[PDB]
């Protein structure tokens, strides 16, 4: 047969990455994907799967595959896993307990940090309740943290809910930027995302 290559390079080798609060989702369909040239890459700091081994995935077909990409701190990548809590997992990106997929991350200090601070990567600091799995929140309403209510203005108990990381190349490895890619293997529709093993 003849098929397009799944555009994973557009996801992993992108020069620009989204903020975790506004995490970008790419829906991949009608293509062939070699999931072990990904796994067998020296690129990644993190490559854990919660469904089936990458070797087993080049056997199966899926109707849709999602590539969620964003940037967080090093010591925050542990939150991108089922049953984790923290500012990122609670307020920015939440995986379900029944997560079927893989979480991939690598250090991007050489590209996402600059002297003086890279303020373009943000994460949600405040929220009334936790996010549900795979929900996205791009709201920017003033969050009232104290007794006083604010009428849309930033106060001492009333914050802008987003927070810049301030990535610098001199930061510690835990405070350095890491790019994350979450692949979710959905099976609903025609299964047109497959591996090269059939």
């Amino acid at each position, epitope marked *: 047969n003849i098929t397009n290559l799944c555009p994973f390079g557009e996801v992993f080798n992108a020069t620009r990455f989204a903020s975790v609060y506004a995490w970008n989702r790419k829906r991949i369909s009608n293509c062939v994907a070699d999931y072990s040239v990904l796994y067998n890459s020296a690129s990644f700091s993190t490559f854990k799967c919660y469904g089936v081994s990458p070797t087993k995935l080049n056997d199966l077909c899926f109707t849709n595959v999602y590539a969620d990409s964003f940037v967080i701190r090093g010591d925050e990548v542990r939150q991108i896993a089922p049953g984790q809590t923290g*500012k990122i997992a609670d307020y920015n990106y939440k995986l379900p307990d029944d997560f079927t997929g893989c979480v991939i991350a690598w250090n991007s200090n050489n590209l996402d940090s600059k002297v*003086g*601070g890279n*303020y*373009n990567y*943000l994460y949600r*600091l*405040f929220r009334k309740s936790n996010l549900k799995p795979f929900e996205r929140d791009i709201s*920017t309403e003033i969050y009232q*943290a104290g007794s*006083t209510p604010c009428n849309g203005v*930033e*106060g*001492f*108990n009333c*914050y*802008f809910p*987003l*927070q*810049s*990381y*301030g990535f*610098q190349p*001199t*930061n*510690g490895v835990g*405070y350095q930027p890491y790019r994350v890619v979450v692949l979710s293997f959905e099976l609903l529709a025609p299964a047109t995302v497959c591996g090269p093993g059939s």
Partner: nanobody
Amino acid sequence: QVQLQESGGGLVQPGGSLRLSCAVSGFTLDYYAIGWFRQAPGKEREGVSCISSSGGNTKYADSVKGRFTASRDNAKNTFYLQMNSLKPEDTAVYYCAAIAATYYSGSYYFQCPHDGMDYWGKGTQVTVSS
């Protein structure tokens, strides 16, 4: 990485005053915010003051407003907190903390949210007693 060295504080009678200093060393950001927090016995740590790296955008809890003034040295990376008309309820350990400013849609925000602060000082004791 930046480090914060607190200085000042100690024991004072009701009605007295104090001045806390916090020296900021290391690779500072172009735009950041310095916050003063305090933790009293039997209570959670509370924010007291917040100031920009410029010296402006000062905010205070309504419990020290009018009595405390945060400021910045104009030739040094040291941030001051002048505390006037001290009362026994002001007795606490005072902490200096640094955080990055938030840049969004072409606008800077200088906040000092407790859970967001990136660097903390060791803290200094402040006792207001008779």
